[PDB]
Tab-separated table of N, CA and C in Angstrom:
chain	number	residue	atom	x	y	z
G	1	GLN	N	16.214	26.450	-2.166
G	1	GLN	CA	16.662	26.730	-3.514
G	1	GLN	C	17.309	25.500	-4.147
G	2	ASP	N	16.956	24.324	-3.639
G	2	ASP	CA	17.511	23.079	-4.156
G	2	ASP	C	16.518	21.928	-4.014
G	3	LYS	N	16.987	20.719	-4.306
G	3	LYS	CA	16.155	19.524	-4.222
G	3	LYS	C	15.584	19.341	-2.816
G	4	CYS	N	14.267	19.158	-2.738
G	4	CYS	CA	13.591	18.958	-1.458
G	4	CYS	C	12.427	17.976	-1.600
G	5	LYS	N	12.173	17.532	-2.828
G	5	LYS	CA	11.092	16.588	-3.099
G	5	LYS	C	11.634	15.176	-3.284
G	6	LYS	N	10.964	14.196	-2.682
G	6	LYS	CA	11.400	12.809	-2.799
G	6	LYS	C	10.223	11.841	-2.697
G	7	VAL	N	10.127	10.940	-3.673
G	7	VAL	CA	9.059	9.951	-3.702
G	7	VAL	C	9.175	8.982	-2.529
G	8	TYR	N	8.048	8.690	-1.893
G	8	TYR	CA	8.036	7.761	-0.773
G	8	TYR	C	8.373	6.361	-1.272
G	9	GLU	N	9.627	5.965	-1.101
G	9	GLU	CA	10.088	4.656	-1.549
G	9	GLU	C	9.358	3.530	-0.821
G	10	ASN	N	8.063	3.717	-0.608
G	10	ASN	CA	7.240	2.725	0.076
G	10	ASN	C	5.847	3.293	0.346
G	11	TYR	N	4.877	2.852	-0.449
G	11	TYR	CA	3.497	3.311	-0.315
G	11	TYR	C	2.606	2.621	-1.350
G	12	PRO	N	1.384	2.205	-0.963
G	12	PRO	CA	0.459	1.535	-1.882
G	12	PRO	C	-0.226	2.514	-2.829
G	13	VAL	N	0.159	2.480	-4.102
G	13	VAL	CA	-0.430	3.370	-5.095
G	13	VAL	C	-1.945	3.232	-5.112
G	14	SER	N	-2.603	4.155	-4.432
G	14	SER	CA	-4.053	4.171	-4.342
G	14	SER	C	-4.502	5.397	-3.568
G	15	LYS	N	-5.741	5.358	-3.083
G	15	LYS	CA	-6.318	6.457	-2.303
G	15	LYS	C	-5.563	7.758	-2.544
G	16	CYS	N	-5.987	8.515	-3.548
G	16	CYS	CA	-5.324	9.767	-3.878
G	16	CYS	C	-6.150	10.581	-4.873
G	17	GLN	N	-6.979	11.468	-4.339
G	17	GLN	CA	-7.828	12.325	-5.156
G	17	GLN	C	-8.077	13.652	-4.446
G	18	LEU	N	-7.239	13.940	-3.454
G	18	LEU	CA	-7.343	15.168	-2.671
G	18	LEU	C	-6.053	15.401	-1.886
G	19	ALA	N	-5.564	16.637	-1.906
G	19	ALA	CA	-4.344	16.986	-1.186
G	19	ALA	C	-4.480	16.668	0.297
G	20	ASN	N	-4.487	15.385	0.631
G	20	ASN	CA	-4.622	14.969	2.021
G	20	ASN	C	-3.881	13.663	2.287
G	21	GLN	N	-4.419	12.559	1.789
G	21	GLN	CA	-3.788	11.262	1.991
G	21	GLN	C	-2.272	11.385	1.878
G	22	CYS	N	-1.780	11.518	0.651
G	22	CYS	CA	-0.347	11.656	0.417
G	22	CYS	C	0.197	12.896	1.126
G	23	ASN	N	-0.534	14.001	1.015
G	23	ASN	CA	-0.131	15.258	1.638
G	23	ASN	C	0.112	15.077	3.133
G	24	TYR	N	-0.970	14.987	3.901
G	24	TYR	CA	-0.864	14.814	5.345
G	24	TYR	C	0.149	13.720	5.676
G	25	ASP	N	0.140	12.650	4.889
G	25	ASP	CA	1.063	11.545	5.108
G	25	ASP	C	2.500	12.042	5.151
G	26	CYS	N	2.980	12.587	4.041
G	26	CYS	CA	4.341	13.098	3.995
G	26	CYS	C	4.556	14.084	5.136
G	27	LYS	N	3.545	14.911	5.378
G	27	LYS	CA	3.598	15.906	6.439
G	27	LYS	C	3.785	15.269	7.815
G	28	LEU	N	4.020	13.959	7.863
G	28	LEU	CA	4.198	13.290	9.151
G	28	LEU	C	4.836	11.910	9.004
G	29	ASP	N	4.451	11.179	7.966
G	29	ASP	CA	4.997	9.847	7.744
G	29	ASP	C	6.483	9.923	7.416
G	30	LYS	N	6.931	11.097	6.980
G	30	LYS	CA	8.335	11.302	6.635
G	30	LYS	C	8.812	12.681	7.087
G	31	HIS	N	8.316	13.126	8.237
G	31	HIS	CA	8.695	14.428	8.781
G	31	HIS	C	8.841	15.465	7.671
G	32	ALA	N	7.977	15.378	6.667
G	32	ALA	CA	8.014	16.311	5.546
G	32	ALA	C	7.208	17.567	5.849
G	33	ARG	N	7.229	18.517	4.918
G	33	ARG	CA	6.495	19.768	5.081
G	33	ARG	C	5.151	19.689	4.360
G	34	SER	N	5.132	18.949	3.258
G	34	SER	CA	3.923	18.775	2.465
G	34	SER	C	4.163	17.750	1.366
G	35	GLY	N	3.088	17.205	0.811
G	35	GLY	CA	3.226	16.218	-0.243
G	35	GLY	C	2.015	16.169	-1.150
G	36	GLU	N	2.045	15.278	-2.136
G	36	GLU	CA	0.929	15.152	-3.072
G	36	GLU	C	1.130	13.983	-4.028
G	37	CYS	N	0.027	13.530	-4.605
G	37	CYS	CA	0.042	12.419	-5.542
G	37	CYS	C	0.311	12.925	-6.957
G	38	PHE	N	1.568	12.841	-7.387
G	38	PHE	CA	1.956	13.315	-8.716
G	38	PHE	C	1.981	12.184	-9.743
G	39	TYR	N	1.467	12.479	-10.938
G	39	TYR	CA	1.434	11.514	-12.033
G	39	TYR	C	2.763	11.512	-12.781
G	40	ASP	N	2.770	10.943	-13.985
G	40	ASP	CA	3.983	10.894	-14.794
G	40	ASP	C	3.672	10.503	-16.221
G	41	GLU	N	3.080	11.441	-16.938
G	41	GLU	CA	2.712	11.252	-18.327
G	41	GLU	C	2.498	9.775	-18.670
G	42	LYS	N	1.943	9.017	-17.725
G	42	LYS	CA	1.690	7.591	-17.939
G	42	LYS	C	0.399	7.138	-17.254
G	43	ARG	N	-0.112	7.959	-16.337
G	43	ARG	CA	-1.339	7.641	-15.610
G	43	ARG	C	-1.032	6.852	-14.339
G	44	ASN	N	0.015	7.265	-13.630
G	44	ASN	CA	0.416	6.606	-12.391
G	44	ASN	C	0.833	7.646	-11.355
G	45	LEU	N	0.066	7.745	-10.273
G	45	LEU	CA	0.354	8.715	-9.222
G	45	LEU	C	1.345	8.159	-8.212
G	46	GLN	N	2.084	9.064	-7.580
G	46	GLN	CA	3.082	8.682	-6.590
G	46	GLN	C	3.142	9.692	-5.449
G	47	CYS	N	3.330	9.173	-4.240
G	47	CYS	CA	3.410	9.996	-3.038
G	47	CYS	C	4.704	10.809	-3.000
G	48	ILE	N	4.663	12.012	-3.565
G	48	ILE	CA	5.828	12.885	-3.566
G	48	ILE	C	5.855	13.716	-2.288
G	49	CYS	N	6.901	13.520	-1.485
G	49	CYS	CA	7.043	14.238	-0.220
G	49	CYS	C	7.966	15.445	-0.358
G	50	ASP	N	7.394	16.632	-0.186
G	50	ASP	CA	8.149	17.878	-0.268
G	50	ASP	C	8.535	18.362	1.123
G	51	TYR	N	9.802	18.719	1.274
G	51	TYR	CA	10.326	19.191	2.550
G	51	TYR	C	10.464	20.711	2.562
G	52	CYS	N	10.728	21.292	1.394
G	52	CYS	CA	10.878	22.742	1.274
G	52	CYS	C	9.569	23.378	0.819
G	53	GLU	N	9.009	22.849	-0.264
G	53	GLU	CA	7.756	23.361	-0.808
G	53	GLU	C	7.894	24.820	-1.221
G	54	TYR	N	7.980	25.053	-2.526
G	54	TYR	CA	8.110	26.405	-3.050
G	54	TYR	C	6.817	27.186	-2.835
């Protein structure tokens, strides 16, 4: 019921067109629960690592 998402303060912005690369990554690269490549009304994706996942 609180903050559980955090951008991977280290990752090459690329390879990201399926809930896997960033996903599986966070799911292990940062002992996370799940992740994904989220944009930002600018056209730039980022490896967002979710630990709680709603």
